[PDB]
Amino acid sequence: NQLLTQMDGAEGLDGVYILAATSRPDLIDSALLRPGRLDKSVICNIPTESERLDILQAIVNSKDKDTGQKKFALEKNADLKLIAEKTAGFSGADLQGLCYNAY
């Protein structure tokens, strides 16, 4: 009841933005979907092979994190970018783990 109040409908409205995450839409407040509340409910999809392409096209660049030496700066397979489309079933789970295995 405190959290359902302080930010909304009083001094406290002013300019604060709020960005949540959940495990479930069940165990969360019925005060969803009000303009005075958390409301937009942005979609996160099931990542396909196309999202595999997207993820590998990100993995291939630790972009400008120490521009003088990229993570995996020196690699084979300059041909066959998207080296791991085979992972299409992985759901993208923590591929930093596979990246550390590769390392």
Partner: protein, 1030 residues
Amino acid sequence: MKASLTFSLSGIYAPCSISRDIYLEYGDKKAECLYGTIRLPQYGPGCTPGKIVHCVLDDSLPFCSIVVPSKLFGFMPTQPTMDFCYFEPILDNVVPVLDSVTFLINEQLYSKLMDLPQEMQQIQFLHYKYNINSMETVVHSRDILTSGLCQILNCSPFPQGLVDFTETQLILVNDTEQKLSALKYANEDEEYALPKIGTNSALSIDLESLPCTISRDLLRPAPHINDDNSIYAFTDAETLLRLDVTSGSFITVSNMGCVRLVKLFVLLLPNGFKKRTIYAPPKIIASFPDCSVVTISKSNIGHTDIPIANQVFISRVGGWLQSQKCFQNIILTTLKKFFSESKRILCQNDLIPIAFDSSMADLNIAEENDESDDEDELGQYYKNDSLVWFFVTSAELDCFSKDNSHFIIDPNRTKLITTNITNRRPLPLSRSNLQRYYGFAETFYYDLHIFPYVRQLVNILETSFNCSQRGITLNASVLLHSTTNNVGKATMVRFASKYLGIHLLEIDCLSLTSNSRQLDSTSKIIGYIRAKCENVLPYASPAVIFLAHLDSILLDVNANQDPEAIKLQKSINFEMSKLLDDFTFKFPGTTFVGSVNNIDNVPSSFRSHMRFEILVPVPSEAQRLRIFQWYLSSHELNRDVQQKVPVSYMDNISFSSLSSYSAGLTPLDIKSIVETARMTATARFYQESKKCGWLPQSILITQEDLSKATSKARNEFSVSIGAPQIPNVTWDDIGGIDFVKGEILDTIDMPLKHPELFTSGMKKRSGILFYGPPGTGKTLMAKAIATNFSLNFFSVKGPELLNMYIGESEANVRRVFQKAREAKPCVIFFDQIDSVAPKRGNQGDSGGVMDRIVSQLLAELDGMSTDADGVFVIGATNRPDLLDEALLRPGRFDKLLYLGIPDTDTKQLNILEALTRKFVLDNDVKLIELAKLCPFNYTGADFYALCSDAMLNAMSRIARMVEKKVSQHNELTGENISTRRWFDKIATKEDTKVVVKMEDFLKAQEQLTPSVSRAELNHYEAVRANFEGA
């Protein structure tokens, strides 16, 4: 410009005349009907806003001479014609046409004109009867146009301007009440005779003190500067001839004792002061207590009877500022100046007032006099603010005797000699103002009809006086205290002192030269207190001692005491007790009048020996009326300000509106609001001055910004106590609540207003409880209450109360809830009571704190005996079954009002339009179309969501249009640009209203869905069907 004045026989509608010479110094052949402007010299604080006048050229008028109609001002040419005025030429004759004018007319001629069905016949009648012609004629807001007949009722918003029926509505009003029989302009009526009006040997008339200052430049005759000074008298009618000796003569008659010669003048023709009177400056009336009917006769004498009195032995009155080292020097120096700068007659048994600015103070000035020429300073800089009386006392007359009234002091043959002091009692204010004559710092005029505590204290002092004038000495004393700060404690004592003609000391304790300092000098401080007091009492008239902030020095025991803390405390109590009681025998009839800020904090001993008690409250609405009536008065604005352009209110101001909207504010806040309004209006004035412009004659206060300033006053209050502010939610920003607004007005408006006829019964409906599904405005109603009514808005946000330690309740809920009793009439808002007050029967483990909160909340809330201080508690809940038996219909919180899903047909429209307030839509897509296109079961705030995301897609449309237009720009000019330069070099104003045409509504209807489904509604509809157990 200076100009000479003359009054014509008057057509009223007939023009004034412009002289050829002014039509050469400001000659303009394109504008032969030169519209002049004149300032009329008058009695009063300053020259009232000048008149624009329509005029005809005349070559016959002597140099700078000008003529205006007499009866246009209600005066007649039988009365003394004033010979001068001031003139201003209107720049390029620039004048606005009036937006509206209203006229009042007698019912006979009103009906005779309204019998004509063709309005143009009345328009020609304006010409045939009144010779009015458009664009030629200028008209003025309230002027009576013929006695018993036509009058202008208002010009608006301007007081003056041009007229044309092509824009001027010419509103007419019927005098059904015949008040035009009384509202006749004629300031003179012919008397039945001049003989038999008394006898020239003896007239008797009430004297009065002239309500204003007057000065040598306004008078018609030409006295000298060095002699003839200071002393003058003013007369009203053919009375000037009943004395046989005209205006400009001396007379000397007095009701008792010695004669007192004075120069008598006719009043200037433009005078507002009541006739059948003889007016005088305070100087004369000061010698003549009561006896207001004065003996009058010719009493003339052949110039000055005595040319010398070779020494004079003057004496000062006792009184507060007349006995201090820091004033002594300025007192003597101003005395020397005053007596040196002019020659005067003086007499034993007479008083001389002296006035000076106490700001001059600890500035000596080294060289201006005695080693320097006689005329020395422009008092324009060497101002005045405070006033003193010197008694003329003995004088050394020659062989001549008895005719002492002519004693005079040659500056070389004579000297003035101090005799230390004398005792005399000042005038009663009821008969005469000093302050309003000298223009000093004001002392607000109470009236005992409507201020109960004033009636109290005035009666106490009145009896203390008169009982000891009779044989019975009274040791009367009183303490004033208040619950709030800043109520006018000192103002009351001062007012009473003047109203009764009683002397006072004015002392404040805060300015004592030491604190409650640890090393004992309570001796030093109480010694200085008595030693400063005593000095005047050996020659005091009946007087009071007023002590400001006794609470600063009468500290009270126990917080953590040093031994010296005990010694100081007891010493102070003892010495003060002795001092006061001793005074009661040291002098009779001399009254201690204290002031304090926390009556709990005054020590018990003093609290016992004190006599009377008076509690002065925050004022009522009935009192507020008179408060505004004072600080919005002409004199009470004009005093503060240099520029010759005066200020006024518009006569439209609703005193009801101020008095209601200013509820709960203290008098000091009312000053703040009015002076802020004055500022904002002057800022508007100088904004107007940026162009050649219009209305230059005077700024007026107006109802809009005077209303606005209340909001700032309330916020500056709130930042002192109760920091939260609230965003505005005006009444129309909600709708579709008709029954609910009904009951809320039946609870917070009608029982609160009109207690003159509402019985104000011995108990009252305590509050309002809103219950139902979320998103039905039940929060919004509270912000609306906070916006529109004058009520303050304290609140706690749900479980803002509960806190870590055991004993939660005193840590919050007690302090806040009593703070609402401590505040002026104010709501407490609650939300989520179903979280704050669990039903006690659902007992909880782990300390059961819910029982502690609920018990303290009920105890502080309910019963409310002797406690109907407007503490409305109002609030919202989700599901009322979880409320405690706190809800059980004792009327402690139980005004249940439901809110729910609207009626299908048009209340959704009322919702959409209300949320469309200050929204914009500008096509044939009427809101009916939207309200029909939306399907039902969408409800409440979900329609605000529908507008919200429609607006979002509308701004998205505008954003992508901007993206296109900026791309097409960057392709052609400004090849390296992005943002700030772009926006600062575009100048859109057609697009910037960014109105949605349509389509955003349709895709909102596609994208939105009801936020609570019927399967969710059923869970609320169950508790709805409980009807809280019915």
